[PDB]
Design a protein around this ligand. Sequence first.
Ligand code: MG
Ligand code: MG
Ligand code: MG
Ligand code: MG
Ligand code: MG
Ligand code: MG
Ligand code: MG
Ligand code: MG
Ligand code: MG
Ligand code: MG
Ligand code: MG
Ligand code: MG
Ligand code: MG
Ligand code: MG
Ligand code: MG
Ligand code: MG
Ligand code: MG
Ligand code: MG
Ligand code: MG
Ligand code: MG
Ligand code: MG
Ligand code: MG
Ligand code: MG
Ligand code: MG
Ligand code: MG
Ligand code: MG
Ligand code: MG
Ligand code: MG
Ligand code: MG
Ligand code: MG
Ligand code: MG
Ligand code: MG
Ligand code: MG
Ligand code: ZN
Lengths: 120, 51, 98, 89, 138
Amino acid sequence: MKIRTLELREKSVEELETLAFSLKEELLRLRQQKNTQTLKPHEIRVMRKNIARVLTVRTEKLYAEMYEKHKNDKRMPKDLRPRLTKAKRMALTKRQLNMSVHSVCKRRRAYPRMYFSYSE
Amino acid sequence: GSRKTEIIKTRLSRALVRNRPIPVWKRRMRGNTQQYNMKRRHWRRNKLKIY
Amino acid sequence: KYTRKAVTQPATGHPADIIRFGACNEKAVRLIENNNTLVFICDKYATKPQIGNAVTRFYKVPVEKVNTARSIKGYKKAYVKLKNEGDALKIANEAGII
Amino acid sequence: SKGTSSFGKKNKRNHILCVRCGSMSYHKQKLRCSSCGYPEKKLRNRGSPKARRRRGEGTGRMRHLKKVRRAARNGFKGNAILRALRNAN
Amino acid sequence: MKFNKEKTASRRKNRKAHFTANSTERRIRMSSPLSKELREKYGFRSFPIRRNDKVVVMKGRFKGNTGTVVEVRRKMYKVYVDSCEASKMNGRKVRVGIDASNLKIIELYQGDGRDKILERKMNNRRMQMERAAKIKME
RNA sequence: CACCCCGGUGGGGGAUCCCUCGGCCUGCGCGCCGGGCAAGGACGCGGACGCACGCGAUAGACGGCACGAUCCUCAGACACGACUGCCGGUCUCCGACAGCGGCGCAGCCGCAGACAACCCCCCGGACUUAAGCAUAUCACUAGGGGGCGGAGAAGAAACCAACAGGGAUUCCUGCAGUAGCGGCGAGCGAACAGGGACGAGCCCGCAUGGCAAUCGGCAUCGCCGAGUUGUGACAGCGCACCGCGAACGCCCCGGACAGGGCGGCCACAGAGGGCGACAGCCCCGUAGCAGCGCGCAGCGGAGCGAGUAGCGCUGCUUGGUCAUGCAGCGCGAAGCGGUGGUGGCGCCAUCGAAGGCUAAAUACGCCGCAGGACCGAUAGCGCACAAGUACCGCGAGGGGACGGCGACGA
RNA sequence: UAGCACACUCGGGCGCGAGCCCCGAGGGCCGGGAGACGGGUUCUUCCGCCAGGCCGCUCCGCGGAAGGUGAGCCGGGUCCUAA
Ligand SMILES: [Mg+2]
Ligand SMILES: [Mg+2]
Ligand SMILES: [Mg+2]
Ligand SMILES: [Mg+2]
Ligand SMILES: [Mg+2]
Ligand SMILES: [Mg+2]
Ligand SMILES: [Mg+2]
Ligand SMILES: [Mg+2]
Ligand SMILES: [Mg+2]
Ligand SMILES: [Mg+2]
Ligand SMILES: [Mg+2]
Ligand SMILES: [Mg+2]
Ligand SMILES: [Mg+2]
Ligand SMILES: [Mg+2]
Ligand SMILES: [Mg+2]
Ligand SMILES: [Mg+2]
Ligand SMILES: [Mg+2]
Ligand SMILES: [Mg+2]
Ligand SMILES: [Mg+2]
Ligand SMILES: [Mg+2]
Ligand SMILES: [Mg+2]
Ligand SMILES: [Mg+2]
Ligand SMILES: [Mg+2]
Ligand SMILES: [Mg+2]
Ligand SMILES: [Mg+2]
Ligand SMILES: [Mg+2]
Ligand SMILES: [Mg+2]
Ligand SMILES: [Mg+2]
Ligand SMILES: [Mg+2]
Ligand SMILES: [Mg+2]
Ligand SMILES: [Mg+2]
Ligand SMILES: [Mg+2]
Ligand SMILES: [Mg+2]
Ligand SMILES: [Zn+2]
C-alpha cells in the first residue's frame, strides 16, 4: 500500500497505463536486487500489489467511463450488461410474461378483481 | 530421453521443482505438524507417468 | 458492429513481463566479461525477438544475437549478445546485474 | 519367456496425456482418450460409480461456479462499479 | 432456554466455531470484564481486550497482579500481561499467556480510536436501554 | 546348565477407557452452469515455499464497504488501517466448429459442453423366483442413449358412471393384496368412489374491408422488411429490515477452581460453548426487543382440429380378461362422432378426440442450516490426519494406512 | 538357522573408524564408446553420513546445498505424402 488509491483516482486512464508500465519497470529493478543483493522481504510484494492497484483503478475508471459512453446505446457492450446467468439473460421479461391475448384482457377488464368480505 | 516434446519437458520440470524437502523455516511455524515431505519422489523407486 | 468487450485490459509483452532478471552466476559473469553477453532469465513463452526487443528497450543497448534455452528448473534462460564492445560489462554495472 | 523376459520389451507407451482431461489415457493409435473420451464432444460415460467422485463436477476448482454461487446469494447485483451507476439512473 | 431454532446449542458446532473462529470474532471472544469504576462510566459489562490495557489478573497463578497488556494473540486465545512472567533456562523472561476471561480491565486504553469504539458501545447501550424503558413504560 | 510356570521391574505392542473441529441419519432451506468461454484439466503465481490449500501475468487480500490492532518461523508489515468479513474486479492455456440453425441480414442472435439425485422420452437385460425349465418372474427394473427444470411431468373430459348422478391434473387416505391376469403354476395386480391436501382456469384456428387496424430491423418518427399462401392485443411488481443484552464474593483443597463449604445475586436470560477440574452471575452467547409502498389501459368472438379416428393384421405392453395401452403396415371415415371392464349388433346414457398453455398441493442429490434414544478412530463416509491422497494398473479403473504432553508459561 | 562378496595382493594416504574409499606397485579379467525407446536430474561440483547399499565405507546412481542443457546448418514443427 505504498501507492495509495487516493492518488490513483485523480489520474486519468491513460495516465494509469503509463504508471503501470513505470511500476512494472521498478519491479524488474527490484527483482534484480533480490537476485544480486538482499532486499526487505516485502518490497517485491508491495511493488507487485501496487501494480495491481493501479490496474484496478484503471479498470474501475474504465468501467465507469465506458458505461456513460454506451449508456443510451441500442446494444450495450456485454461488459456493461449485468452478468446474471445465461438462463437469466435469456429469460422472458416480466412484460413479456404478462402478455395475454385480447380475450383475456377483455375478461379481466370487464370482470375485475372484487374486494369483499363474507359473514354469516 | 534427450528427445522430448514441449509438454513432456514442462511436466518433467514441474515434477523436478516439486521434488524438494520442506524448507527449514517451516519447521519453526506454529501448527506445523509436518516434519519431512512425505511426497518426496526418488527417480528409481517412484515412477512419474510422463510419456 | 458494436464493441462486445468495452473494458479491455492493457496488452502483455511489456519488457518487464518478458525479463525476470539478469543472472549473476559464475557462468553469467564469464559471459559478460569474455563474450560481451548478458544472461537474462526470462518468461518461458517469450520468443527471441521479444527478448531482444526487451533488452534494447529496457537497457537501451543494441543486441546482436539472442540464444535461448528453456531450463529444467522452469524458466527460460536467454543469452543476449550485445553489438558494441565492452557493453555488457557497461550494462551489468549500471543495471546492477553484477 | 511369457513373463519376466517379455517385460523387457514393454518400452512403448500407448496412452499419453489427454489435452482435455489431463490423465495419461489418450491413446496414440486410437486417437481417443480412454478416460474422458476426447475427441468426442460429450464426456465419456464414466466406467464406475466412484469415477464421478474422482473426476466429476466439484472435484476441481469450480472457478466460475463459486463466483455464481456468491452472486446468487447476494441477488446477482453484479459489477460493483456499474451497480452504483445503474442506481443513480 | 434458547427459543431460536436457527442458532445451535450443539456442542460440536459451538466448539468448531470457537477454534475456527476468524480474527474478527476472535477479538470479541477475547473480551474481559471491566472494573466497577469503569462500569459506572461506560456501563457495559465487558469489552474486548487490547494491548496497553491495564489489567488485574483474577484467576490462576498470577492472581492479584496488575500490569499492562503487552501482547494479545488471537490464535491460541492468549493475553500476555506485563509483570506476569516466567523465566526460561537461559535467563530469558517470557510473558505467560493468560486467558482473557481471567483478566479484569482496570484502565481502558483510549489511544488509537478506541475511545470512539468504547463510546459507540456505550451509546448503543444507552439508546437500547431507552427503548426498553419506553416499552416497559407502555 | 537349559526348559517351563508364577510374581516384580524393564521391554514389546497398541487393546481398554476417557476424549472428538469427524461421520451417519432426519427435517428444513436453497435449487443459481455454459462463446460474458462452462465442468474438468494443463501450466504458472509466496522474500525465504515442498505438500496441502488459495490464486491467475492485477497470479498467496487488487478495489469498495464494514471491522479496529495485531500478523509472525525469520525478516518485516501496521491507524496513510494489522488480522479479518462481505461483495466486486482481474481471471493464462487446453477443453464446447469440417460446425449447425434463425432473422433481409450494412448486421444481430441461438444450438453445441457440463450436471445424471429428482423428472420426461426412447432402447432394454440377465442373475434371480418358479425347488428343473422354455411362457411367466426378476422387470416395462438394472443399464445405455437423449432431454429439461427448480421442480418436472400431468392437467381443464371424445372422463367417471348407471345414481336422487358426479366433474381438470397431481398427492395422501382408501377401495385392495380386491376385481382380475397367470405353465390359473410361481407369482402378479389396478380403477371409480367415500375422506382429505391443494385448488384455477384458459387459448390458437374462419377477426376489418369505408383500406393490416399487426410485427421485425435500423444509421428511427422515416426508411427497409415480414405479412393477404392472413398479421393483430398489459396486470403486476418493489424497497426497508438493528445492536445492545441481567447477575459473585469470601474460605478450603489443588499446578490451576468451574470443586467443597458459607453467604448473596440475576433471570422474558438455569440453551449451549469457552475459560489451567464440573460456571446462570468470568467470557462468547442465551431470553428479549424494528417495517412498508407503487401499479392495472383497447376494438374480433359458433372458432374445431384427416392419411387422423376407426377397422384389419402384426409386434410390444398392461391387472385389462374374444384386447388395456403403444407402434408399424393395409384399409380409410363422418356430419354427427367417441365411449359405456371393453365379442358382434341394437338401445339408452354420457362425453366431443385427432391443436396449445396452465400455478398449488408432489419428488429430490450436491450444498447450507438445524436436530438426533445414531457411531465414537478396526466404529462412523473410502477419508476425524498433506484422502480420492500415497500407491497400483497399458487401460477402463482400483485405492489404503495414520487422532491425543502441558497452564502453547517452563 | 536357510541364506548374503568369497582374483586379487602389497605399501602409502585422508580419517574417530578402512579387506572394499583414494594413490602407487604387482597380478589378473572383459568389452568399451555413441544414438533411439524408456528414465528424469540419476549428470557435475562442494559438503555430508553413525540412515540406505544383502558386510563395512571416509565411498556412492544415497542425504543436503548448488551448478548445468545456448543452434539459420543436429532432430521435430513452421513442408510433403505412405499404409
Ligand atoms: Mg522419451
Ligand atoms: Mg526400475
Ligand atoms: Mg491482465
Ligand atoms: Mg534452443
Ligand atoms: Mg515390441
Ligand atoms: Mg500401438
Ligand atoms: Mg513372567
Ligand atoms: Mg490403530
Ligand atoms: Mg442431508
Ligand atoms: Mg475462464
Ligand atoms: Mg485489499
Ligand atoms: Mg447437451
Ligand atoms: Mg437379486
Ligand atoms: Mg429356477
Ligand atoms: Mg433352486
Ligand atoms: Mg438351472
Ligand atoms: Mg438449470
Ligand atoms: Mg409443466
Ligand atoms: Mg409386473
Ligand atoms: Mg389471427
Ligand atoms: Mg451479557
Ligand atoms: Mg394408423
Ligand atoms: Mg351418442
Ligand atoms: Mg359395463
Ligand atoms: Mg383440447
Ligand atoms: Mg482406540
Ligand atoms: Mg476408518
Ligand atoms: Mg500386471
Ligand atoms: Mg549360515
Ligand atoms: Mg568375482
Ligand atoms: Mg551412452
Ligand atoms: Mg555422480
Ligand atoms: Mg553410513
Ligand atoms: Zn481425456
